[PDB]
Amino acid sequence: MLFQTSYTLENNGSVICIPNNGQCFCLAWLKSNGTNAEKLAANILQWITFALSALCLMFYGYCGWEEIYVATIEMIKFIIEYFHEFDEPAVIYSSNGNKTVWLRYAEWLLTCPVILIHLSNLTGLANDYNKRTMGLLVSDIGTIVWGTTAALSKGYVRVIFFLMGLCYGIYTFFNAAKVYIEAYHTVPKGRCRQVVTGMAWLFFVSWGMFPILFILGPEGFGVLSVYGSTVGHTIIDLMSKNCWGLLGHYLRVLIHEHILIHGDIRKTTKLNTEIEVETLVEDEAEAGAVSSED
Amino acid sequence: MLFQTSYTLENNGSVICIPNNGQCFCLAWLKSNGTNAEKLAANILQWITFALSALCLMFYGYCGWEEIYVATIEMIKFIIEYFHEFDEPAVIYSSNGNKTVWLRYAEWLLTCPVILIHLSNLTGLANDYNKRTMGLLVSDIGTIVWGTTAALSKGYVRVIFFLMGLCYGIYTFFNAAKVYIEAYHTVPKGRCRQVVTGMAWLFFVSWGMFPILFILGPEGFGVLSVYGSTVGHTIIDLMSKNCWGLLGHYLRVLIHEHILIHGDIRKTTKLNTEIEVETLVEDEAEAGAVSSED
Ligand SMILES: CCCCCCCC/C=C/CCCCCCCC(=O)OC[C@H](O)CO
Ligand SMILES: CCCCCCCC/C=C/CCCCCCCC(=O)OC[C@H](O)CO
Ligand SMILES: *C/C=C(C)/C=C/C=C(C)/C=C/C1=C(C)CCCC1(C)C
Ligand SMILES: *C/C=C(C)/C=C/C=C(C)/C=C/C1=C(C)CCCC1(C)C
């Protein structure tokens, strides 16, 4: 540690004395991060993630910028974890006694908006983004900022900022859901609709797990230890980023093959909220005005 | 303060003893935030900003969501400053001795992307955003994340993260410049082109001042004190947000009046990098294919 770890209790445990060496001191910081079993598990999941993220980068290496940016950051993340995981400021040890994993929240700020940009162009064919895309990004940034602030805070201040994060988060989840519904009815009828369905399940489950891990972790009720929280977070990271990004590359190849073999043939379908989506079709026998009541 | 402020030096200044009351302690945290003159100046500029931001909200209150979101956050910001400016986590007092103004960086994360979204639709007429818009947002988020990490860090770690912020920042500034060039040649020939020119000056000067205030502040070489840094930051805040947002509302009204009186009549002008922009014109005697060599 690069904070004070050696001290003496004096006067029946009522006074703590430390070397006057310029280092900060706090008992709360010295609480254990967890068991050796938790530590072993965390280093394994990290290695798996560093390696798999590096494989994904090379694999994608065989437009497309979103999968690479996230996979690059995940890799960079491990080297910092690997060398300085518990060094400030990968973990912030603050005057109120909290341990805040800035690396995680910073990583979310780097990667989550890019995932949402990817989500807004699942097929990869669009060159533009609507107004709703922008709201998705702004709501998500706020979620992380409130969540980070909550983690840095204590008591009632933590609770309030968490709840604003929850309000921002619901708005994010709701609009993400809207995007996936449009995407499902946009992509061709076969395999493309299977992949999109898989991504929705992956997305809502993995992203939905995050507020839960927060509540359980040191940032909430301290059920999970620091290592415990790391293991959980790396799991849902693999889901939310690596696996989801894999599917996204796969989905985009499938969309590309469809347009190469069949060309870009569109049919307008309307979904009655009442939304309209231009579905990709396979042959020119369809170019009509189809609908679908929900 | 809610950290330890009372201590005794023992053994010829080599041992510090504190009450064992659970509070964290560090000498670095107790350094003064600055002179009383600096404090007075900071409270004045904050009040000016709280009031003026509230005026802007009501004033805009007489599409348009970007001016309100930023002005709302600025207002909320002051109430937190007003009640808990130097309470954790508005300022983070970390184990490495740094004081990091999380409120500022968090505020930047909330407001700067929205300013850039506004910038990407200065006229307010567009319903879509290109790929380049998305890069603008992603580069800017990275800047803040690296800058925040640099502020939280020390020594060579601070320097590296600052430089990545600088690389991200240049990419942001460059693309912002691209947007303003397109915007200038898009808006009508008269007053609209004056306002856009004003915004470019405001934008690059106020945003450009931020890395400079960083280098001078406690986050860098400690030339400026904490209060000193606050005063500077509130000034360029008024420029980057309040004044710029004012012009943006004004610019959008002017664009709206043009389309109401004259309708939406466009002419394609091409700018030889070679870029094409559809300029708004006043009468149907222009609908041609004009160009302009740079
Ligand atoms: C994400 C979109 C779908 C929403 C589903 C969300 C997942 C579960 C959240 C649940 C209830 C909120 C719980 C609020 C309590 C949190 C307060 C806290 O963290 O505890 C602080 C306290 O000071 C320490 O003792
Ligand atoms: C923003 C786009 C246009 C670019 C214009 C930028 C404005 C000026 C930046 C300049 C040089 C960079 C200076 C790099 C030195 C910073 C390192 C530092 O902060 O000092 C840490 C040290 O450890 C404490 O003693
Ligand atoms: C790669 C990392 C990802 C996809 C992280 C996602 C994180 C979230 C969806 C976090 C959500 C939260 C809330 C819904 C409420 C406030 C607490 C948070 C930040 C954990
Ligand atoms: C309302 C707040 C605004 C507009 C803040 C803008 C901040 C910046 C443009 C900061 C830029 C930085 C760099 C260019 C390099 C790294 C250090 C920063 C974060 C100060």
Side-chain angles (χ1 to χ4, degrees), chain A residues 3-62 64-130 132-188 190-270 275-283 285-294, chain B residues 3-62 64-130 132-188 190-270 275-283 285-294:
Chain A
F3 42 76
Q4 190 53 56
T5 58
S6 78
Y7 61 97
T8 70
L9 295 206
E10 302 291 330
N11 292 7
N12 194 19
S14 65
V15 176
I16 300 176
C17 301
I18 48 150
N20 194 357
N21 57 0
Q23 294 190 358
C24 307
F25 168 83
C26 201
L27 279 177
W29 300 336
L30 310 163
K31 286 184 306 231
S32 68
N33 296 323
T35 83
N36 282 210
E38 284 183 326
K39 179 79 147 131
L40 190 67
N43 302 21
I44 291 318
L45 284 180
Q46 283 165 159
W47 277 104
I48 285 183
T49 300
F50 171 71
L52 183 298
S53 101
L55 293 197
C56 293
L57 205 191
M58 279 86 164
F59 171 58
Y60 300 150
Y62 291 11
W65 71 265
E66 311 109 319
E67 307 92 275
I68 288 65
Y69 186 80
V70 180
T72 307
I73 298 295
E74 264 200 300
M75 201 188 337
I76 300 157
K77 172 215 189 51
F78 171 109
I79 76 149
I80 301 174
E81 289 190 311
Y82 176 72
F83 288 138
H84 306 283
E85 190 178 350
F86 292 104
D87 298 334
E88 281 229 11
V91 178
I92 301 170
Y93 309 83
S94 59
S95 51
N96 69 9
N98 284 357
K99 293 173 185 174
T100 300
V101 190
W102 168 247
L103 182 65
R104 176 187 308 153
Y105 304 119
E107 183 246 32
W108 296 353
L109 283 165
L110 290 176
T111 64
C112 297
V114 174
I115 283 156
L116 290 182
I117 291 163
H118 188 352
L119 172 59
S120 306
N121 190 23
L122 278 176
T123 68
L125 307 178
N127 299 148
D128 292 70
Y129 302 87
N130 53 12
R132 151 205 87 167
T133 306
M134 292 320 227
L136 178 87
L137 293 179
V138 172
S139 63
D140 178 62
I141 293 154
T143 300
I144 300 157
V145 172
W146 303 136
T148 308
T149 303
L152 287 168
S153 299
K154 285 211 180 255
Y156 295 83
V157 181
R158 168 178 288 180
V159 173
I160 296 170
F161 284 115
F162 181 84
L163 290 176
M164 332 178 66
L166 210 66
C167 298
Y168 270 68
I170 288 153
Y171 183 100
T172 307
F173 279 79
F174 181 73
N175 283 281
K178 240 204 150 172
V179 178
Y180 278 107
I181 282 158
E182 298 188 8
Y184 180 88
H185 296 351
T186 296
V187 301
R191 238 186 291 179
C192 289
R193 263 192 179 81
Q194 283 158 265
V195 174
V196 168
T197 290
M199 292 185 162
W201 274 105
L202 260 182
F203 180 89
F204 286 123
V205 165
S206 64
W207 285 52
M209 276 293 100
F210 281 95
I212 306 163
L213 285 186
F214 191 105
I215 288 165
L216 288 40
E219 45 251 76
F221 294 129
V223 175
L224 290 164
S225 71
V226 170
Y227 296 138
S229 174
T230 300
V231 309
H233 274 100
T234 321
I235 290 176
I236 66 179
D237 277 351
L238 285 164
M239 296 180 95
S240 61
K241 303 155 138 91
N242 301 84
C243 298
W244 189 93
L246 226 39
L247 284 179
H249 184 82
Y250 182 59
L251 176 57
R252 281 164 163 191
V253 312
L254 248 60
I255 296 296
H256 190 71
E257 279 171 12
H258 180 278
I259 280 190
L260 287 182
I261 297 158
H262 304 76
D264 194 313
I265 321 159
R266 245 94 197 269
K267 94 153 156 290
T268 65
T269 84
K270 74 68 176 192
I275 37 161
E276 150 178 8
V277 315
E278 240 181 326
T279 310
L280 290 154
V281 293
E282 283 178 37
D283 66 321
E286 278 242 46
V290 185
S291 317
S292 270
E293 288 73 307
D294 304 331
Chain B
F3 42 76
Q4 190 53 56
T5 58
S6 78
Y7 61 97
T8 70
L9 295 206
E10 302 291 330
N11 292 7
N12 194 19
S14 65
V15 176
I16 300 176
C17 301
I18 48 150
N20 194 357
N21 57 0
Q23 294 190 358
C24 307
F25 168 83
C26 201
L27 279 177
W29 300 336
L30 310 163
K31 286 184 306 231
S32 68
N33 296 323
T35 83
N36 282 210
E38 284 183 326
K39 179 79 147 131
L40 190 67
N43 302 21
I44 291 318
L45 284 180
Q46 283 165 159
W47 277 104
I48 285 183
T49 300
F50 171 71
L52 183 298
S53 101
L55 293 197
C56 293
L57 205 191
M58 279 86 164
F59 171 58
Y60 300 150
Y62 291 11
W65 71 265
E66 311 109 319
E67 307 92 275
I68 288 65
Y69 186 80
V70 180
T72 307
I73 298 295
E74 264 200 300
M75 201 188 337
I76 300 157
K77 172 215 189 51
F78 171 109
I79 76 149
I80 301 174
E81 289 190 311
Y82 176 72
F83 288 138
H84 306 283
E85 190 178 350
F86 292 104
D87 298 334
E88 281 229 11
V91 178
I92 301 170
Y93 309 83
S94 59
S95 51
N96 69 9
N98 284 357
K99 293 173 185 174
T100 300
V101 190
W102 168 247
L103 182 65
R104 176 187 308 153
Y105 304 119
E107 183 246 32
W108 296 353
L109 283 165
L110 290 176
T111 64
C112 297
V114 174
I115 283 156
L116 290 182
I117 291 163
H118 188 352
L119 172 59
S120 306
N121 190 23
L122 278 176
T123 68
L125 307 178
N127 299 148
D128 292 70
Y129 302 87
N130 53 12
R132 151 205 87 167
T133 306
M134 292 320 227
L136 178 87
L137 293 179
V138 172
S139 63
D140 178 62
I141 293 154
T143 300
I144 300 157
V145 172
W146 303 136
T148 308
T149 303
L152 287 168
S153 299
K154 285 211 180 255
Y156 295 83
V157 181
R158 168 178 288 180
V159 173
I160 296 170
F161 284 115
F162 181 84
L163 290 176
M164 332 178 66
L166 210 66
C167 298
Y168 270 68
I170 288 153
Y171 183 100
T172 307
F173 279 79
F174 181 73
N175 283 281
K178 240 204 150 172
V179 178
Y180 278 107
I181 282 158
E182 298 188 8
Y184 180 88
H185 296 351
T186 296
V187 301
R191 238 186 291 179
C192 289
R193 263 192 179 81
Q194 283 158 265
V195 174
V196 168
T197 290
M199 292 185 162
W201 274 105
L202 260 182
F203 180 89
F204 286 123
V205 165
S206 64
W207 285 52
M209 276 293 100
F210 281 95
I212 306 163
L213 285 186
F214 191 105
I215 288 165
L216 288 40
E219 45 251 76
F221 294 129
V223 175
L224 290 164
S225 71
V226 170
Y227 296 138
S229 174
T230 300
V231 309
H233 274 100
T234 321
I235 290 176
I236 66 179
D237 277 351
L238 285 164
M239 296 180 95
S240 61
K241 303 155 138 91
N242 301 84
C243 298
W244 189 93
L246 226 39
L247 284 179
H249 184 82
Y250 182 59
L251 176 57
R252 281 164 163 191
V253 312
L254 248 60
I255 296 296
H256 190 71
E257 279 171 12
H258 180 278
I259 280 190
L260 287 182
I261 297 158
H262 304 76
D264 194 313
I265 321 159
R266 245 94 197 269
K267 94 153 156 290
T268 65
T269 84
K270 74 68 176 192
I275 37 161
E276 150 178 8
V277 315
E278 240 181 326
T279 310
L280 290 154
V281 293
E282 283 178 37
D283 66 321
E286 278 242 46
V290 185
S291 317
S292 270
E293 288 73 307
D294 304 331

